[PDB]
Write a protein that binds this ligand. Sequence first.
Ligand code: ZN
Lengths: 246, 203, 72, 283, 275, 117
Amino acid sequence: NKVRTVTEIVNSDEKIQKTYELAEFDLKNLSSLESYETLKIKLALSKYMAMLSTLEMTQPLLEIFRNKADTRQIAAVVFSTLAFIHNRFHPLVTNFTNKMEFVVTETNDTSIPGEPILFTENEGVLLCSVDRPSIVKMLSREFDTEALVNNCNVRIAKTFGASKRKDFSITEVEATQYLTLLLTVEHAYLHYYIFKNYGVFEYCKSLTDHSLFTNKLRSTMSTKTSNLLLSKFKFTIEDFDKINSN
Amino acid sequence: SLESYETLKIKLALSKYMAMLSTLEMTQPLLEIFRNKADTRQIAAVVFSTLAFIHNRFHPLVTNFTNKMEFVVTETNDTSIPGEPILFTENEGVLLCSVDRPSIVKMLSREFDTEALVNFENDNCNVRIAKTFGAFSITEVEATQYLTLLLTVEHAYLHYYIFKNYGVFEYCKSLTDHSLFTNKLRKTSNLLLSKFKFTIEDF
Amino acid sequence: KADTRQIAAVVFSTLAFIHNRFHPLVTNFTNKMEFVVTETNDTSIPGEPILFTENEGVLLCSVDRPSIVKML
Amino acid sequence: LVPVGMAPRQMRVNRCIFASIVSFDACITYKSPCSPDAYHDDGWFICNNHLIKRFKMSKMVLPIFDNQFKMTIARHLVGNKERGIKRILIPSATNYQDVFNLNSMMQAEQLIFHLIYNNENAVNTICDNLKYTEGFTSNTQRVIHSVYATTKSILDTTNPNTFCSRVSRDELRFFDVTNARALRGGAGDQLFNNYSGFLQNLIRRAVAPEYLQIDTEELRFRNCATCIIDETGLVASVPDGPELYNPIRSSDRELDRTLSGYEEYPTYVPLFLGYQIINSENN
Amino acid sequence: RVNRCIFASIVSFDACITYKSPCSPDAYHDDGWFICNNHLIKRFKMSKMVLPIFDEDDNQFKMTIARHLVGNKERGIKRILIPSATNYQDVFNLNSMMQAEQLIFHLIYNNENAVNTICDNLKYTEGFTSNTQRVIHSVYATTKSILDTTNPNTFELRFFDVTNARALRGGAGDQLFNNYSGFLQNLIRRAVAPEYLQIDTEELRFRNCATCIIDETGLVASVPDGPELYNPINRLQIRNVLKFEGTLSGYEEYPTYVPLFLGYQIINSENNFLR
Amino acid sequence: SKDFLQLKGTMNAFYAPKQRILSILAVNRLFGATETIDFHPNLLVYRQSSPPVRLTGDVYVVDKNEKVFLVKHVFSNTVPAYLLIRGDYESSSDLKSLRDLNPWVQNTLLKLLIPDS
Ligand SMILES: [Zn+2]
């Protein structure tokens, strides 16, 4: 809210009182935090793009996922993303230990809605199932590069305080594609983490209801690991209450 | 009257600091000096001379003072601590003095309420009228800036004295907790920080 | 509209004159000043043809030249 | 992949040749010391550190003018009492092998020198020895090829412009003692010609002319020459007599009471030699 | 705070005239100079400078030296720095300067006839006896005291014309130096740096060629031969408004100065005398 | 052409808006102009430049106070003419008196510059 300060000389009683409104410092703090988080997320995204480049695949991401024949590259990209997320949670880890299998489904009766990437052991080693058609559909869905997204007082204050500044094939569309892939693989990684550390039955229960994620993860994630990418924003379904009533 | 005499003594101390500044013989005002990052040597000399001046005042019988000190003018936010623009670290036997030039520049550039506030003063219209019938300078703003810098370096020098007298451990603990010098004078009298009080209240 | 130089000069001179009229001892403005001349309603704010906003390093004065012309 | 197909990216580039020095023994890690100046896109293709270490020379700027033009210039680091080989500021192709202790420094730097100085025989000898030395194929071969390619790229950047400057009519430079009535000047132009194109560019960037005729105006920076050129190369010697005192105050009470803040003339010895002519500004 | 600002002991004896005396602070420096920087610049086209010699640990020999303020186009009178007594009256536009300054110059050059003429002319000022004579006394006494202080004969092996190779014969620049007043001689010593410095059989060369010239006309910022050395140098306006908000910057600059380098200084068995 | 408009009261002067240029043909007449534009000082928009923009060839001073200059210019297709410019400019060579110009350009310049009070 507000505070005030009083200046006074030791030998004198003439005191000068000033008042401060903390809203200004609140704006400073909020702007600083927003900038810091934006920088962190952009750094992570750039790092992801850079390692994918390091793999040195000729085609762009969407073309790769469209090329059904080249399962090799799909598996490479998926594993690299999964390992990147794993390290982002455990920076000291740079490999994945146990070897990994991969399969690329091609039909609805082979895919599971809501979990394009999933895991299942063959009783000896873990296999990652990929819904390449779903990946292609997500990355191909037309994106909005125009509309903006969003207290009016602090909004205006930020508008008037913060400033603005007026050879890569990447547009905002490709950045969005990369972010979507990262988020999907992050969701899959959370499922896999719950699996590995709580058993296949717990993994199935999580698939049924993600709410268990709360405890099964926050026990370790919020404390020791970098926050989830989604943590950058609070997400919600438009007209959620009426939709639920429906 | 008496309080006026102590005011005169305080202004004399400020004038002595002014003599030190003139001895340094800087072409620019301290505001411009701090604004100019390239003037790293000038900034370091200013800080060192202020520290020596404060040391002489705090220990009138002691004229000695560290005649060499490592200096680093910091600019980045991650290179500064809120509430401690000046810092005294040790790089394994090497004494480093870190300076938060952006913070110094901000404080100096802050507009002061010279005219805005009205305060009591020797004011007799009869004397003014009688005078009327019988009939290089420093502004109030500059004096305020100069006092601010002197008090900043006074805080820094107190932390430095804690560092030298007690050690780096106690210096860090003092940085964390400043309660050590609520008593202050207990030498200190020559330090302006012991002349007034400042407080913050929830409001 | 082309000669933004003169618009900025006049605006700054007026602002400094008022500033001095409030603080006669001041004859300059210290910190340098930026200036921009809006040209559209979606760029202008009603009721404040002249306004200020810092770029986090220095203050910029926004001018609604169309509104100034309309008034005069 | 992220970047457009090919699409050569644009970034800064370290320019000093010696930045490419690396231990051919991959099992031995080495870092060369480079002054940050190397990352300035200027005529200098050697960083301050390498310049001082190998040539005994320090960069410097000479304001020139209405419009203040800045002309590059180097200065002596040679002390007064240095003699003989020590006075060779930049050795010639016939003496660099001796002035520079190839044995005492790294093979990569020896190759760099045998490239700068047009010593194809030595370059080939080093290449063959490295072919038949250590695990050449594994990574030493690639490291050597990288260093050679970098050096050759720098030289190919420099030499064409150097030759065009040589045959240039508008811009003319003459590295000799403008006091033709002197004996220590000699065929300085001939010796400069003997130097390699890149070496010639370095000499141009380092040695300022005693005089400079711009169009119709001539500016005389010196009434004397601070260095000479002979068969040995660029020599930090006074052409007329006693060497200039070089205090070297850094790097390798009443007096002050009066001499408080007070303009001080540097004791440095810049490089002034020869005649330069130019038409228009070309700046 | 002894103000040695010779040419600031000038009083506008004329009531209508006020002498600002806006001259350099360094006059309060107890140095070898008897004329501070701004007077030097104005009346001799020289800028004070210092040349360190030995500066390693505590040996801090810092020989003083002044700089040319003469371009590479001026000649004759325009180029003369310190004119001789025979030509100083011509080089300086004494008539364009205050009579007190003229008196100072005449005293410096020992032009007692001009001094007498000036005081005779002042005899006919309206407030002559009241305060003009007081001003005369003050200025004359100050100048005489300064001159006596400078003169060493009152109550070492520096040769200025002995550097000049290619000269036919004669030197004689040291002859004219001797002919100069003690103040002028001390000024020359203080501002001009011998090109060579020999200490107990140890010679240091500071330049490969002397920069100043000394002849009958006096001290000249000329070269021993060839062309002259290159020597370069709020009211808000409409033009003062800058446009839209938007190359050896990383290297230091060698001064384009022409310091007074001329002569040979010989020092006997005396060691690095630092008193 | 549509790229410019002939200045009213001139047989050899035209203005290109997109270029913000006033040009005067050295020896050639204009033709075909169905439209004309009245001269106005705003046309000579003052060019801003922190360092004076250097100019070459023949340069003439029209108004030193207003930094107005006339620059000899030949269109690449070899059409001689002069460009009237206003802004922060400097000349590589010595500036030249307007009397050197031909009576044709001089008359056009008088018409364009002297206000018709
Ligand atoms: Zn380097």
